[PDB]
């Protein structure tokens, strides 16, 4: 209900990154508050490698210049970004038509990774079939279904495709295999990664099947009042100086104490939500109870907001996995079996059940609802439909193909 405190207790509802940052932000204001290997080896990857080939070949000044323009618009993931006409306009010419650029852009189609800088899928695959041996049984078939009738192929249906395009069920299917064993997205062939992405907070204790309030590693912003500057307080020269020093000291003590207060709160706060939830970890990701913040403040010795703020932006970590405290929040779901359920558990089960099914005859919604009722979960058919279509799981009736 306080200013000098209303924030001193909202200053923790953020991540430790920002906290450190704002702590530095206010670490300059208060004088008395304080806390080789240059061998970076380089590489290539279809930008420099693509450019590398450019030089070796015999391309004239006007052609070389153009080459870089198109070799630089090649998105790393696979194909180029902008259209072809774009490229003609970004040369800055009027005498140069598409034909001139066509060649230069056609010549590159056959470099390191055959199919690099293709644009609009079809051209890529089509080219790849050109460098193949013409003494290939499904050469003409594949090509015929590459220039046209691709939409149908893309669909789950294939019978309507063969009947119209003068194709048989036996040979044509095998032509598919030569189009299927053809690798679109050749641009990632010479691609690779080397990332990390990991944050620490409250770890695990691992004591007789239990992880807890453990300890704090590196998250406490060293806030020790300076003693060389504090000695001059009592022996201040003017009134100005004394006032200054005392104001800054009191605010420093305030901040010391608020930082220490924030630590402890979240320190032992990481042992009741996660305990009220001893099924998602031990048993697994399937086996999950519904939990609510309102119910968490009821279990623990504190207010709802108090606990909501501590838990927000606090990535937890157990040898079983690292998930943010706020992500544990789940709605409700009647079950009638000694405890309600959650929709995340619906989603994981839908997914593990679509994984273990017949590949040719797909599983479904009413079927999934019935399976759930068999195990004793009793949910709606909608919740399943929603949780299925939320995970970008394609329709299972459209996921069928030729076994």
């Amino acid at each position: 209900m306080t200013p000098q405190l209303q924030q001193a207790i909202r200053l923790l509802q953020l991540s430790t990154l920002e906290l450190q940052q704002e702590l530095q932000q206010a670490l300059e204001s208060n004088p008395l508050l304080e806390e080789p290997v240059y061998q970076g080896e380089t590489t290539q990857t279809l930008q420099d490698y693509l450019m590398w080939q450019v030089e070796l070949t015999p391309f004239t000044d006007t052609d070389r210049a153009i080459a870089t323009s198109i070799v630089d618009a090649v998105d790393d993931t696979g194909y180029l970004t902008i259209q072809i006409e774009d490229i003609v306009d970004s040369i800055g010419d009027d005498e140069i038509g598409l034909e001139e650029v066509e060649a230069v852009l056609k010549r590159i189609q056959r470099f390191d990774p055959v199919g690099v800088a293709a644009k609009d899928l079809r051209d890529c695959l089509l080219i790849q079939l050109s460098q193949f041996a013409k003494e290939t049984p499904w050469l003409e078939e594949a090509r015929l279904i590459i220039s046209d009738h691709l939409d149908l192929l893309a669909n789950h249906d294939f019978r309507t495709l063969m009947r119209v395009t003068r194709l048989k069920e036996e040979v044509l299917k095998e032509a598919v295999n030569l189009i299927q064993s053809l690798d679109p997205r050749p641009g990632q062939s010479i691609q690779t990664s080397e990332p990390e992405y990991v944050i620490p907070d409250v770890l695990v204790r691992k004591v007789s099947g239990r992880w807890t309030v453990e300890l704090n590693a590196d998250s406490i912003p060293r806030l020790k009042i300076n003693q060389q500057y504090a000695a001059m307080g009592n022996s201040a020269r003017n009134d100005a100086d004394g006032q200054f020093i005392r104001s800054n000291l009191q605010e420093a003590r305030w901040l010391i104490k608020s930082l220490e207060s924030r630590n402890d709160t979240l320190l032992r706060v990481s042992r009741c939500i996660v305990e009220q939830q001893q099924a998602f970890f031990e048993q697994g990701e399937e086996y999950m109870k519904p939990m609510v913040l309102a119910d968490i403040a009821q279990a623990v010795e504190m207010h709802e907001s108090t606990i909501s703020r501590v838990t927000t932006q606090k990535y937890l970590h157990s040898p079983r996995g690292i998930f943010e405290l706020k992500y544990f929040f789940s709605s409700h779901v009647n079950t009638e079996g000694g405890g309600e359920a959650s929709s995340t558990a619906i989603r994981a089960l839908v997914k593990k059940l679509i994984a273990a099914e017949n590949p040719a005859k797909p599983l479904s919604d009413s079927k999934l609802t019935s399976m759930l009722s068999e195990q004793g979960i009793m949910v709606a058919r909608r919740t399943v439909a929603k949780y299925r279509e939320s995970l970008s799981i394609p329709p299972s009736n459209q996921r069928k193909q030729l076994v």
Binding site: D120, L121, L153, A154, N155, Q180, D183, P184, R185, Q188, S189, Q191, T192, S193, P195, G284, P319, R320, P394
Partner: protein, 100 residues
């Protein structure tokens, strides 16, 4: 994402994957030479959103386009010889233990 060591990576022929296991791990006794896949493992790259071409492409193949970034072991260019045995350590609590 959790890059799972599979046995069906992209941008690689079946002949090269004929030495791998069902869980993706070079059979002990194989005469691995030169630079070949030893332990398949695909890193889950942040998938995109809509972008029509991907949707069409995804359906065409499936479980490959906009999925992962192949990056296995690959015997160091200049090493050869039969592979005596392979050891495998997994974090307790992880639902795996395929070849373990």
């Amino acid at each position: 994402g959790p890059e799972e060591i599979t046995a069906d990576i992209p941008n690689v022929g079946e002949a090269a994957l004929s030495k791998l296991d069902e869980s993706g791990i070079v059979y002990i006794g194989a005469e691995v030479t030169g630079g070949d896949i030893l332990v398949g493992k695909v890193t889950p790259k942040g998938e995109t959103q809509l972008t029509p071409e991907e949707k069409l492409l995804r359906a065409i193949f499936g479980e490959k386009a906009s999925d992962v970034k192949d990056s296995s072991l690959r015997v160091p260019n200049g090493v050869s010889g039969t592979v005596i045995d392979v050891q495998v350590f997994t974090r307790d609590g992880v639902e795996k233990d395929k070849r373990a």
